[PDB]
Design a protein around this ligand. Structure first.
Ligand SMILES: Nc1ncnc2c1ncn2[C@@H]1O[C@H](COP(=O)(O)O)[C@@H](O)[C@H]1O
Ligand SMILES: Nc1ncnc2c1ncn2[C@@H]1O[C@H](COP(=O)(O)O)[C@@H](O)[C@H]1O
Ligand SMILES: Nc1ncnc2c1ncn2[C@@H]1O[C@H](COP(=O)(O)O)[C@@H](O)[C@H]1O
Ligand SMILES: Nc1ncnc2c1ncn2[C@@H]1O[C@H](COP(=O)(O)O)[C@@H](O)[C@H]1O
Ligand SMILES: Nc1ncnc2c1ncn2[C@@H]1O[C@H](COP(=O)(O)O)[C@@H](O)[C@H]1O
Ligand SMILES: Nc1ncnc2c1ncn2[C@@H]1O[C@H](COP(=O)(O)O)[C@@H](O)[C@H]1O
Ligand SMILES: [Ca+2]
Ligand SMILES: [Ca+2]
Ligand SMILES: [Ca+2]
Ligand SMILES: [Ca+2]
Ligand SMILES: [Ca+2]
Ligand SMILES: [Ca+2]
Ligand SMILES: [Ca+2]
Ligand SMILES: [Ca+2]
Lengths: 122, 122, 122, 122, 122, 122
């Protein structure tokens, strides 16, 4: 599931919604896209399953990545803005529990914080 | 200068705040930690300047990572639960704009979504 | 993000509907298929990004292709019937505008016109 | 035997008519043209007889192509917008039948659909 | 186009339906998955065209596979339960006829039979 | 046990019964057979026990395979129709449980489904 469209709401809740469309899905991956004149938005979902080691816990990775590509204009070359998260847990782990850590992160990361981060505050 | 402690609120704004203590800070990097009875929590905040290459844009990268370490229990080995974010932008980009993309992601990633992700939905 | 099926209405609007089933989608490419007793129908959708070159505009290609395949019948060997379209525009162009040209072509190409084409009327 | 003019109605039926003038016809090929202040329109019709081979069916190609060319404007260089169709069938096939497939495609390709294609929806 | 979900009804038409979600589709292949508390379920549907050899019939092969993964429990390691089918026929065979053989097999394989098989009875 | 004859009921329940006779049993394998003028039917049952690995779960495989061999006639060379299933579980596994997964598969695989499969629907 997840959806046929994916909405990136810039500025968070109540911000500017950008509705991307699913345009491709290969290798446990999805790609949503929304072209515009000045830039384009792309969102990718990826799932991985680290290989089984002889004597080790086997982990799974889930990743979501937002990317705004700003096309080159004038002297200014093309560049990008990008944000993404990764969730990693062992195979049989309790979903609810794992989800809670992700929820904790989303909660932690608000506008105020992002500000400080960009300001190199550790 | 994010503070001496860092609070991880499990399950989102709901509750169960784990207040980690700062335990190290080197190279624009901080680490907080909270050892508990059957698991411990650790948070890392890092800032980086991506390798400058001749003809091309230079990016900065900011990362925040939450980690829960569940100690081994009887026959069950020790394992981890981990979630992290990475914000990447060109040097000199408009921070407010950049912040909006991160804001958009945190907003997008809620309990409902993590549920789906863990289920390998794309 | 096209849909589990794709209908080919032979003879255009009000004609004979042939609803094909999506059987694959990889590399920004779809494939629908409908096998029948005497022939089979197959539709493919392909998206391309033309070779980005130094001082030139970068284009994208969008192609859709219908193909009825009539199986060999006695003396008569197997053969096909194809019809496909290609839309080409530069990255960043205005969708509405581009779409209008495609609409213009679809509109232009009616039964009467196809008749002439098959008749080699140049 | 096509006619002194060819009209490209942008936006399909009821849209903006651009009546091009036939300017050449050689080798089972036509060319219409309509120059304008900011862009020019050009339509071409081509008929081909594919390479006759030993033990194989022989096909014929029929192609029609619309091309708006937007002249350079200040910083903005010159670029085009193309839409073209190709019909392919074996020699001797039943015109009516072949025509039906073309009609099916024209019918299929409407504004809504072009929108999706330009959007890379596969 | 089998659908977004796939239901595995444990114990036959009796009950205990596990509704798996589609999580991937590449190369005429789909994969559904349902992670649960102490085990997870996965289904795969694949289609193949067997390697064409000079003088000889060419076959198509269809496969459906159900898999239950029981996570490790204490000292007991993780293991699997798996059942799958393969239908193989010449290209262009009469599908209805082919279907009848598969139908015959599903019919033959009931609870009573599986019981015997597991007991190594021939 | 299992029987001295094995009945393949084409078209599933209520279909055309073909009663094969056990003609050979070697290596934890059985072979039933029913010759006819135009074709012949063969059913094979096979049991395997994957080798004991140092640190791994040891599995057993049970396989049943139906095969109709259609003798060559005229230009048409001899070809085959074949369907088979495989059940795989660890050695000490609970039979009833395993059986239930097999039952689930047989149940899933009905005429309707086989149709779609042959049609390459994933
Ligand atoms: N839902 C699933 N949960 C865990 N492993 C899976 C799942 N689906 C597929 N896999 C396995 O993971 C492989 C793909 O992993 P990657 O490293 O992304 C597949 O080829 C399967 O062997
Ligand atoms: N607040 C800042 N904004 C931009 N660049 C900085 C800042 N603080 C340090 N730097 C640069 O980043 C380097 C360390 O980055 P490192 O992490 O790859 C320093 O030596 C400075 O050149
Ligand atoms: N939605 C999109 N719009 C434009 N370019 C894209 C898009 N998605 C992917 N691409 C780029 O086009 C490549 C594939 O080009 P094509 O050939 O299928 C990808 O590897 C990307 O570099
Ligand atoms: N009306 C026609 N139908 C089929 N083949 C034709 C027709 N007119 C000409 N040809 C053949 O096709 C050739 C041109 O093929 P094409 O390439 O334009 C001519 O030299 C003839 O051999
Ligand atoms: N519905 C279909 N019926 C028969 N052949 C097909 C069908 N869809 C794809 N194919 C062929 O099978 C190839 C992929 O098979 P792969 O799996 O070995 C394609 O490249 C086609 O040549
Ligand atoms: N009923 C049984 N259950 C499990 N293993 C068996 C059984 N009978 C025989 N075996 C073992 O499995 C071997 C044959 O396995 P294969 O790989 O089919 C025999 O030589 C025995 O060592
Ligand atoms: Ca903001
Ligand atoms: Ca795919
Ligand atoms: Ca929660
Ligand atoms: Ca320090
Ligand atoms: Ca018609
Ligand atoms: Ca329009
Ligand atoms: Ca049962
Ligand atoms: Ca039947």
């Amino acid at each position: 599931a997840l959806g046929d469209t994916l909405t990136i709401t810039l500025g968070g809740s109540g911000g500017t919604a950008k509705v991307l469309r699913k345009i491709n899905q290969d290798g446990y991956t999805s790609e949503y896209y929304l072209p515009e004149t000045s830039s384009s938005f792309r969102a990718k979902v990826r799932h991985t399953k680290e290989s089984v080691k002889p004597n080790q816990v086997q982990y799974e990775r889930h990743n979501v990545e937002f990317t705004e590509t700003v096309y080159a204009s004038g002297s200014t070359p093309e560049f990008v803005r990008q944000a993404y998260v990764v969730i990693r847990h062992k195979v049989g782990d309790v979903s609810a529990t794992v989800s809670d850590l992700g929820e904790a992160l989303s909660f932690y990361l608000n506008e105020a914080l992002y500000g400080k981060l960009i300001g190199w505050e550790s």
